[PDB]
Design a protein around this ligand. Structure first.
Ligand SMILES: CNC[C@@H]1OCCc2ccsc21
Lengths: 338, 286, 240, 58
């Protein structure tokens, strides 16, 4: 049955390339060409948030802006105030390697966990002005790479054991497990509908999981290296993906095909973080060559360079309303641009 | 004629020292990746050299040029006190840099816990304070000649430029407070560092030679040779003059005092521009 | 206003705490403890004491060391290794009395060959290109008992043993038996050859002979860290 | 065997993957471009606002 399985699978996949290629009739570059260029948009650094002692690995804007939380190798999950550049909390962690960070959509809880194999939940507001751990989610067998909040009572985690699992923080027990990945996954971006999410593994592939039925539905390929970051389009129809081959791609969930791709011969480093603006015309991205290029989402023409950092940019996030960008680096300095 | 060439070389010295010190100051201040406490000592030394280039050397230049003092006695006193303060500041900064390197390369484990910014700030304060009090006390409180007055009035019987007069006690006091102690400390520290570096280099060379089938002397030698050649003769002549009957022509004295300036010129090319990381940062500025 | 004063006071408290934490953080050195599962990492860690990282904090000569058991992770592609690019040294425990013993996977080769492959991968990693390796070698008495009591010899599993002579640096201070020191110094040769092929004076390798239970391991780590940091400082000022 | 069973499961997953509806890339591109001016009026980032609304003034 082994040979039969192999031949059937390879014939089906040969058919599926034909099915994908049949849908193609043109390219989005040709379709949009007749649009005026974006211009020479320029960003000037406004404020710098200092106080960290090591390399920031993550940050996450709040729900109504004005707040952002960052995690470092020191073991401090500092919570800043984005208007007065002041600090509100200095929660000391137990493990000194955290690679994830997630502010709750309601503003009550924070989650943070790295090489400890355990995801922890912190309760900000209590009867007194003290922050203490509320639960410690355990059951994984590898380093945590991403975790996002689905609501006040559900959390989705992505770990290094090539499995993605959904938890439920009232008893600390798993609910659904998403299996099917070969390499480790290091990117977990939710959707505005809060019903679908994608994962980007190291096998140069991506899948579209369903939170309601718990099985894969879409398989996306086209890269030649591991996936470092991923992020949906504001509309909810496409996502951007970054790799280590200095290439950015905009896949589609409707036609199940790779759309127009970004590239530039003067860049040889690897993408570290990708996110969209509010409208969906600017696509900021990080790089290992100490800057943060800003692409055009339609015509692929560089519209500026967000340089000013001293080391690698590790993470960045655009605020909800759209009046703020922030980039974290190994320089131990957060920089909130405009 | 001779005077025109003299002006050419001297103004070349002032311009080059100002340019070097300003470049070092700007490079240390502007960049953020160079903020370790040792660079603060280097920057303080650079500012001392910049002030020494901006204040005193034009007037010394003109004095030595025409051998006459077209100024006032109070201005001369200010000039002398400033010169004495700004030379001792540089010497003390060199000694403190030597002590810093000694702690760096002799106690590697407890290096970042004993060379915090507080200690460096105290070092800079004690480097700037003591020379000032010492010089102003010696000059304004008429203490350099207080021991003997007949010799001083013989000294002012002739010439007419304001040359610095040192008694038999004031001379030895200046010698054993601004040259001897820092020199001895630098000698001992650099000799110990040389021994340690030689031992480690020999072990590494032996290991790599066995598995295969002198920067220390070139680095410490430059610093020590520059410092000794630029400072020693002046202080030897200065201390020996009071014991003799002042039979030394000023033709030696002007060269001796200009050697100190030349040393102040040659500081940022031995302490800043000689290491690779500083050049890398400067290129990254471009 | 009164709202601003509370925020400023909280910021002052946070900064005051962070100053103390900064003062504490500069006086600790970080060390990794890569090694094989069957090797005596657990015994050494327990001795230093007297489900991922099991960080242990010990102290010797008024300085604090910070050591990490990272054996819970999986194998291949080793992508967590990027973070440990600021540590001082990588302790590497290897059991020498395993030339005959085979890992649970029968298809897999001898444990010593796997240890050599892991050492090669760690040494030639591009991220770990500026950190030394403090190589240990445990299970010393077991190797002696194995070699003295006849049984299968090294030549069966290691063919090149025949073309070997004891080096001129061997110092058998206990003076137990010359047939054991030959194998003991043979074991070092593979790791030294792996270490000497690369180089150019950026990271070194300090081999050692020790048992699981005996003392002086902390002293050895202390001395090796002192030497590593001293050479690192010496090479900045263009002295070495 | 167990490996054969998991391979069969992967084949079933692939066959479930293949039986999905598709669409022309042109329509998706048109929808994306239309949305690219539908909400582009806001553009707090693409179109700079006067320095009186931004809470991040110097
Ligand atoms: C550059 N000249 C140095 C200055 O000259 C006046 C006497 C004196 C004593 C110590 S330093 C000094």
């Amino acid at each position: 049955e082994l040979d039969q399985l192999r031949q059937e699978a390879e014939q089906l996949k040969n058919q599926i390339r034909d099915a994908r290629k049949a849908c193609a009739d043109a390219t989005l570059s040709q379709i949009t060409n007749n649009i005026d260029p974006v211009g020479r948009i320029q960003m000037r650094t406004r404020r710098t948030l200092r106080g960290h002692l090591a390399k920031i690995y993550a940050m996450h804007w709040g729900t109504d802006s004005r707040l952002l939380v960052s995690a470092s190798q020191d073991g401090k999950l500092i919570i800043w105030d984005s208007y007065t550049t002041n600090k509100v909390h200095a929660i000391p962690l137990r493990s000194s390697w955290v690679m994830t960070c997630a502010y709750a959509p309601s503003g009550n809880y924070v989650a943070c966990g790295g090489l400890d194999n355990i995801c922890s939940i912190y309760n900000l507001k209590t009867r007194e002005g003290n922050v203490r751990v509320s639960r410690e989610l355990a059951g994984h067998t590898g380093y945590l790479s991403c975790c996002r909040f689905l609501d006040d009572n559900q959390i989705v985690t992505s770990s290094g054991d090539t499995t993605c699992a959904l938890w439920d923080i009232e008893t600390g027990q798993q609910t659904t497990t998403f299996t099917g990945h070969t390499g480790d996954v290091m990117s977990l971006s939710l959707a505005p509908d809060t019903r679908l999410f994608v994962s980007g593994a190291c096998d140069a592939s991506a899948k579209l999981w369903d939170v309601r039925e718990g099985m894969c539905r879409q398989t996306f390929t086209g890269h030649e290296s591991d996936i470092n970051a991923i992020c949906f389009f504001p509309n909810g129809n496409a996502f951007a993906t970054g790799s280590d081959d200095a290439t950015c791609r905009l896949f589609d969930l409707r036609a199940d095909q790779e759309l127009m791709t970004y590239s530039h011969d003067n860049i040889i480093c690897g993408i570290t973080s990708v996110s969209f603006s509010k409208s969906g015309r600017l696509l900021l991205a990080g790089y290992d060559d100490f800057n943060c290029n800003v692409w055009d989402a339609l015509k692929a023409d560089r519209a500026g360079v967000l340089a000013g950092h001293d080391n690698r940019v590790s993470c960045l996030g655009v605020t909800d309303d759209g009046m703020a960008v922030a980039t974290g680096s190994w320089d131990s300095f957060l920089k909130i641009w405009n | 004629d001779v005077r025109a060439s003299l002006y050419s070389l001297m103004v070349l010295i002032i311009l080059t020292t100002l340019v070097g010190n300003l470049i070092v100051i700007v490079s240390i201040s502007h960049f953020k990746q160079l903020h370790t406490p040792t660079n603060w000592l280097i920057h303080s030394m650079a500012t001392v050299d910049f002030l020494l280039g901006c204040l005193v050397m034009p007037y010394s230049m003109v004095r030595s040029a025409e051998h006459c003092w077209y100024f006032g006695e109070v201005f001369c006193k200010i000039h002398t006190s400033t010169d004495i303060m700004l030379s001792s500041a540089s010497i003390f900064h060199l000694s403190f840099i030597s002590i810093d390197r000694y702690y760096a390369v002799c106690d590697p484990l407890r290096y970042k816990a004993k060379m915090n910014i507080l200690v460096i700030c105290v070092m800079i304060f004690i480097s700037w304070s003591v020379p000032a009090v010492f010089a102003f006390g010696m000059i304004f409180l008429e203490l350099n000649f207080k021991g003997a007055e007949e010799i001083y009035y013989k000294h002012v019987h002739c010439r007419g430029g304001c040359s610095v007069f040192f008694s038999k006690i004031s001379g030895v006091l200046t010698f054993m407070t601004s040259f001897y102690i820092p020199g001895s400390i630098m000698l001992c520290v650099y000799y110990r560092i040389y021994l340690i570096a030689k031992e480690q280099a020999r072990l590494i060379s032996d290991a790599n030679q066995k598995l295969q089938i002198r920067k220390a002397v070139k680095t410490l030698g430059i610093v020590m040779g520059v410092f000794l050649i630029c400072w020693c003769p002046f202080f030897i002549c200065t201390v020996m003059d009071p014991f003799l009957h002042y039979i030394i022509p000023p033709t030696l004295n002007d060269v001796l005092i200009w050697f100190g300036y030349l040393n102040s010129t040659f500081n940022p090319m031995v302490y800043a521009f000689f290491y690779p990381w500083f050049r890398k940062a400067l290129k990254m500025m471009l | 206003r009164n709202e601003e004063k509370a925020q400023r006071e909280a910021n002052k408290k946070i900064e005051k705490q962070l100053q103390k934490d900064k003062q504490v953080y500069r006086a600790t050195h970080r060390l990794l403890l890569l090694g094989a599962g069957e090797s005596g990492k657990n015994t050494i860690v327990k001795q230093m004491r007297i489900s991922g990282i099991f960080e242990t904090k010990f102290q010797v000569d008024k300085v604090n060391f910070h050591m990490f058991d990272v054996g819970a992770q999986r194998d291949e592609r080793r992508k967590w290794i990027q973070c440990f690019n600021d540590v001082t040294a990588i302790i590497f425990v290897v059991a020498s009395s395993s030339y005959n013993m085979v890992i649970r996977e029968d298809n897999q080769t001898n444990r010593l060959q796997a240890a050599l492959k892991l050492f090669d991968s760690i040494w030639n990693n591009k991220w770990l290109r500026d950190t030394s390796v403090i190589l240990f070698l445990n299970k010393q008495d077991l190797l002696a008992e194995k070699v003295l009591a006849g049984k299968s010899k090294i030549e069966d599993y290691f063919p090149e043993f025949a073309r070997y002579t004891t080096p001129e640096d061997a110092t058998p201070e206990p003076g137990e038996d010359p047939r054991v020191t030959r194998a003991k110094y043979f074991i070092r040769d593979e790791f030294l050859r792996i270490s000497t092929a690369s180089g150019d004076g950026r990271h070194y390798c300090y081999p050692h002979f020790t048992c699981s239970v005996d003392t002086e391991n902390i002293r050895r780590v202390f001395n090796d860290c002192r030497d590593i940091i001293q050479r690192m400082h010496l090479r900045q000022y263009e002295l070495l | 065997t167990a490996s054969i069973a998991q391979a069969r499961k992967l084949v079933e997953q692939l066959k479930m993957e293949a039986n999905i509806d598709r669409i022309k890339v042109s329509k998706a591109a048109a929808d994306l471009m239309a949305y690219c001016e539908a909400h582009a009026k806001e553009d707090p980032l693409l179109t700079p606002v006067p320095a009186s609304e931004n809470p991040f003034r110097e």
